Write a protein that binds this DNA or RNA. Structure first.
Ligand SMILES: [Cl-]
Ligand SMILES: [Cl-]
Ligand SMILES: [Mg+2]
Ligand SMILES: [Mg+2]
Ligand SMILES: [Mg+2]
Ligand SMILES: [Mg+2]
Ligand SMILES: [Mg+2]
Ligand SMILES: [Mg+2]
Ligand SMILES: [Mg+2]
Ligand SMILES: [Mg+2]
Ligand SMILES: [Mg+2]
Ligand SMILES: [Mg+2]
Ligand SMILES: [Mg+2]
Ligand SMILES: [Mg+2]
Ligand SMILES: [Mg+2]
Ligand SMILES: [Mg+2]
Lengths: 171, 159, 51, 220, 185, 55
RNA sequence: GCCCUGAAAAUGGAUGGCGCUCAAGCGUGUUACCUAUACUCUACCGUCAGGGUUGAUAUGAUGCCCUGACGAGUAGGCAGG
RNA sequence: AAAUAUGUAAGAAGUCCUUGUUACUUAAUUGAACGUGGACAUUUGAAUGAAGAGCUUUUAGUGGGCCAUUUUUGGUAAGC
RNA sequence: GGAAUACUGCCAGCUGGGACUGAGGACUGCGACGUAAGUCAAGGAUGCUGGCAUAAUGGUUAUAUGCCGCCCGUCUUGAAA
RNA sequence: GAAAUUGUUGAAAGGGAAGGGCAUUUGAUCAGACA
């Protein structure tokens, strides 16, 4: 769905031996807070000896894009499971917000590698601050000075079944 | 043909515990059982007399008779669509006192003490157990406990 | 003989809940809140924007 | 007996309505103060560099979304004990350890969450029926509520709502008095192509927390 | 669809009216139907239900049983109520001076009660005297003394009578009833 | 012609139609199987305490 | 990942058919929309349950009336016609 | 050495104080069993539900089964 | 540094259009608006008006059109076979 | 003086069966109130 980025902060349940346990934070892309908390325990159980029954959520807050109307180049590191084995992958996405870039990432993985949501882990999303650090040619071609391109063969949508003249594809 | 002897399928059930073979310690014979006591059944493999049948292993019953070296226990057994009353003659080596009520008798004593104690001061003595309740609100401080960010790890073999 | 839903039949809404008259008269469904000025501490903001 | 007894009865009714009027006013300020205190508590914790952890929810509303065919025995018994014997039936459940384990056994057959005050008020006003002498009686007047729950101090429909949202000493009696709610299918649909998956996985069953309010209101 | 927890359209299983077509019995039922509705007295409800009972469920009550009940402490001046037949009993030689209300009296039972100075009245006369059942004793006869009961529950180690026509030496005393012939029950 | 040998299918469902009756408990359970020496003296103990209350 | 080679059966032939190629195909996301004897509300029939009503001068107290819930079915049982 | 299944308990037929019976038992009014009288009411001893619970008599049909998910045996396998 | 808007939620805020339904049959109840008398959308529809009074509505029947419908009985795990 | 079955007359339909269910058109035919 349309993803939102949440920060989720959790802890182990305090006891008499260890009052005030350590706080752990991570950033989760999810469509709503219910899924976001579910994903938090999914990754925490892969890193520390804890689960939902023996822990609690401290706070969950939505994180907005600082400059949502600025074009940014993103580098994304992902880990996904194919039909046989697990692989690491680096991809680059151009967009105006992290949530928009993540949406493209899930669509790209499903289209090119048939990887569903359950088979993908987003390791890191980082904005590429400097040009010449972009290492994918399908992104670099949009970084040239005075970029211009036409849109040949325009197709117009017709609201009526029949048309009384041959249409043109000029643009 | 099939075999359905009295001690069939009891290869592991009637074994002794590891490094716990030999004679029975004397505290087994010094315990006192009275009619109405609640006991649980666990056969001892080294005592072949007065041994319960394998069905009653792990079952709990009430004493109804006391004899020289044995007691009588009542067990409810489900046969078909109803329970039937079963009476067993077991030597004391195969039984022990059940702790399923020794922790309940103390609550009975505690209720009476609490009921009498609050009789002179406060009504609603509140002597009913309650299940675990949802947690109340709390404040968590970050002084010396700044949250640490975690991220999923990349895949490695390390074989 | 015929159940009439309150919150659409006003007369039934007044039979039950006599306080409904006061609630509507004082516009308690659109009560303005008192303005505050508490600001989050620096540690909260830095954690929220942290990578 | 043409005007003496009738005048006394009218005088008694005037007194009863005055008591209800004062109680509803007191309930309104109680709700408003509690909501503002929680909001201000969050702001104070953030200002001090701390995190305010809200108390866990004490009430849930459970809606059965599965038919009556092909149900295993243990979940089938739990649904009967929660008075959910047909699809789109709903009841309120008090949250304890003994009832959380009940919900875990019936996850793929129900949808439940945390109801709000608006949802509770609309459910009782529109579809609130009382179990009186083993019969389903509509709650069209305050007298029938007082005649059955007056011994517990509940004498109006707002008092019944107050006992539900704030889980009071007599929650069990007040909740069992209410007949299980008969809801319809949602007006705008369920929002998913397939209901019988978990809410996390794009389905309908399980715990959806505060999202239960949108679902119930469309079904009410 | 409804997941029913109980059987649907189940009758109560209790008689709500007499099975008989006796015109006079239906009149008594009509009288006590009115009384049970508008008196809130537990006696009237008990009598009304007793009028629906079948013959085996209304055993006869003898005068000796009546005399024994009147020997209870403080029950010497109560009205004995029997919803059924009152029979005579010659095994007793002394009878008190009580008042008995019953559906039927045998010729011997009526003579003995009248001879001792008492009176025999019908159930409708009782209603006039005691609309709420004041100072009444309800007596019921024995149900398990019926000859058909002793055959119920027949089986091994049950100690019940067998269903048999001729009783004697050669009738069901062989193998199965003694250890000398196979086994004993 | 060979046929089915054994199965417990549907047997639990039949048992739960009316069955699974919890056994009823009576005050004064029967003294069958109790030690005869105890029963002889308990009979005399009951007889003696009857006279104490009667007198 | 998709596509292709590997890939041979007998009457003529079947993603159900036509047909479809930035699909009307494959993976994925967001909405609108269509319709079951299911769900919600109402009426009517029957069944079961709980209740009201013998007061004469107008007829059925197995009568009349109030309230709630329920309704699949072979073998088979019972009831009213 | 799990998971799932599985036995028992969560009170009035309960607890406590005092002291009666016996041919049983004890070195012994020691104990055992059953009782007299006194003290503690239903936040009276967890949760939820309960078209009320308990009980009896009598008799029909049936006693060829088969399928699906999961566990599982023989068999290369089978719509075995 | 000061606002706006988006998203989510609440209102015992107001208001327009469309469809289905009208069960009940003296009075009785709970309320509302009124100084009062009274009134009311408050325990189930009334008011006003037009055409026709007959095959016009409707019933029956034959036919046509859209969609649906395999031969009953019997044994059987399984019958249109 | 019934049915199977058949003749004549009248009406209707018919592109490898016929018959049936729900709804309405068309044709034929018919009861009920005129208060
Ligand atoms: Cl199904
Ligand atoms: Cl089978
Ligand atoms: Mg031996
Ligand atoms: Mg729609
Ligand atoms: Mg769907
Ligand atoms: Mg067989
Ligand atoms: Mg697609
Ligand atoms: Mg339907
Ligand atoms: Mg039927
Ligand atoms: Mg056979
Ligand atoms: Mg017509
Ligand atoms: Mg067809
Ligand atoms: Mg065959
Ligand atoms: Mg056939
Ligand atoms: Mg002739
Ligand atoms: Mg002919």
């Amino acid at each position: 769905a349309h993803f939102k980025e949440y920060q989720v902060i959790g802890r182990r349940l305090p006891t008499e031996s260890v009052p005030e346990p350590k706080l752990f934070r991570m950033r989760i892309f999810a469509s709503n807070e219910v899924i976001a908390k579910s994903r938090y325990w999914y990754f925490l159980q892969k890193l520390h000896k804890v689960k939902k029954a023996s822990g609690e959520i401290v706070s969950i807050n939505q994180i907005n894009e600082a400059h949502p109307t600025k074009v940014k180049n993103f580098g994304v590191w992902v880990r996904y499971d194919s039909r046989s084995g697990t692989h690491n992958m680096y991809k680059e996405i151009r967009d105006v917000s992290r949530v928009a870039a993540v949406e493209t990432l899930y669509q790209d993985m499903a289209a090119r590698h048939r990887a569903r949501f359950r088979s993908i882990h987003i390791l890191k999303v980082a904005e590429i601050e400097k040009t010449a650090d972009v290492k994918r040619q399908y992104v670099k071609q949009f970084l040239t000075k005075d970029l211009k391109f036409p849109l040949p063969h325009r197709v117009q949508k017709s609201t009526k079944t029949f048309s009384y003249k041959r249409p043109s594809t000029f643009y | 043909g099939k075999s359905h002897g009295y001690r069939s399928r009891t290869r592991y059930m009637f074994q002794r515990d590891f490094r716990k073979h030999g004679a029975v310690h004397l505290s087994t014979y010094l315990k006192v059982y009275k009619v109405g006591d609640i006991v649980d059944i666990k056969a001892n493999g080294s005592i072949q007399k007065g041994m319960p049948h394998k069905f009653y292993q792990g079952k709990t019953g009430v004493v109804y008779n006391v004899t020289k070296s044995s007691v009588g226990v009542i067990i409810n057994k489900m046969v078909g669509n109803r329970y039937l009353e079963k009476r067993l003659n077991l030597r004391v080596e195969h039984i022990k006192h059940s702790k399923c009520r020794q922790e309940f008798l103390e609550r009975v004593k505690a209720n009476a003490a609490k009921r009498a104690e609050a009789k002179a001061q406060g009504v609603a003595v509140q002597l009913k157990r309650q299940p675990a309740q949802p947690r109340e609100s709390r404040i968590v401080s970050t002084e010396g406990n700044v949250p640490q960010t975690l991220a999923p790890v990349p895949y490695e073999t390390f074989i | 003989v015929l159940k009439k839903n309150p919150l659409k039949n006003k007369q039934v809404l007044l039979r039950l809940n006599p306080y409904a008259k006061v609630f509507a008269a004082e516009k308690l469904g659109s009560k303005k809140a008192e303005k505050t000025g508490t600001k989050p501490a620096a540690v909260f903001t830095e954690t929220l924007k942290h990578d | 007996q043409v005007a003496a007894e009738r005048a006394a009865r009218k005088a008694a009714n005037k007194e009863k309505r005055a008591i209800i009027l004062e109680r509803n006013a007191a309930y309104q300020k109680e709700y408003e103060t509690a909501e503002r205190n929680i909001i201000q508590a969050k702001r104070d914790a953030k200002a001090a560099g701390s995190y305010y952890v809200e108390a866990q929810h004490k009430l849930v509303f459970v809606v059965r979304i599965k038919g009556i065919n092909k149900i295993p025995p243990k979940p089938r018994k739990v649904l009967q004990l929660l008075r959910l014997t047909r699809i789109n039936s709903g009841t309120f459940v008090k949250v304890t350890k003994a009832t959380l384990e009940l919900l875990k056994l019936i996850e793929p057959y129900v949808a439940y969450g945390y109801p709000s005050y608006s949802t509770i008020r609309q459910l009782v006003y529109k579809r609130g029926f009382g179990k009186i002498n083993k019969q389903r009686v509509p709650l069209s007047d305050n007298a029938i509520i007082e005649a059955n729950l007056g011994k517990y101090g509940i004498l109006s429909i707002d008092d019944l709502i107050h006992e539900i949202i704030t889980v009071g000493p007599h929650f069990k009696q007040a909740n069992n008095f209410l007949w299980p709610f008969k809801l319809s299918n949602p007006s705008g649909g369920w929002g998913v192509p397939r209901k019988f998956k978990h809410f996390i996985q794009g389905g309908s069953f399980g715990n959806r927390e505060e999202f239960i309010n949108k679902l119930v209101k469309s079904m009410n | 669809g409804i997941d029913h927890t109980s059987k649907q359209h189940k009758r109560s299983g209790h008689r709500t009216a007499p099975k008989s077509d006796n015109v006079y019995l239906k009149l008594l039922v009509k009288l006590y139907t009115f009384l049970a509705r508008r008196t809130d007295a537990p006696f009237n409800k008990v009598v009304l239900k007793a009028l629906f009972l079948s013959k085996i469920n209304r055993p006869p009550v003898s005068v000796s049983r009546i005399a024994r009940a009147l020997k209870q402490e403080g029950a010497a001046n109560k009205t004995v109520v029997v919803v059924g037949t009152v029979t005579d009993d010659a095994r007793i030689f002394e009878f008190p001076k009580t008042t008995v209300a019953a559906l039927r009296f045998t010729a011997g039972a009526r003579a003995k009660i009248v001879k001792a100075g008492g009176e025999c009245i019908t159930l409708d006369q009782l209603a006039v005297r005691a609309p709420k059942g004041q100072n009444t004793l309800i007596l019921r006869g024995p149900r398990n003394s019926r000859e058909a009961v002793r055959h119920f529950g027949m089986g091994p180690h049950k100690g019940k009578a067998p269903r048999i026509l001729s009783t004697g030496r050669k009738f069901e005393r062989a193998r199965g009833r003694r250890r000398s012939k196979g086994f004993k029950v | 012609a060979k046929s089915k040998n054994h199965t417990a299918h549907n047997q639990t469902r039949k048992a739960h139609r009316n069955g699974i009756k919890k056994p009823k408990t009576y005050k004064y359970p029967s003294l069958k199987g109790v030690d005869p020496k105890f029963r002889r003296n308990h009979k005399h103990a009951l007889h003696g305490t009857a006279k104490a209350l009667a007198a």
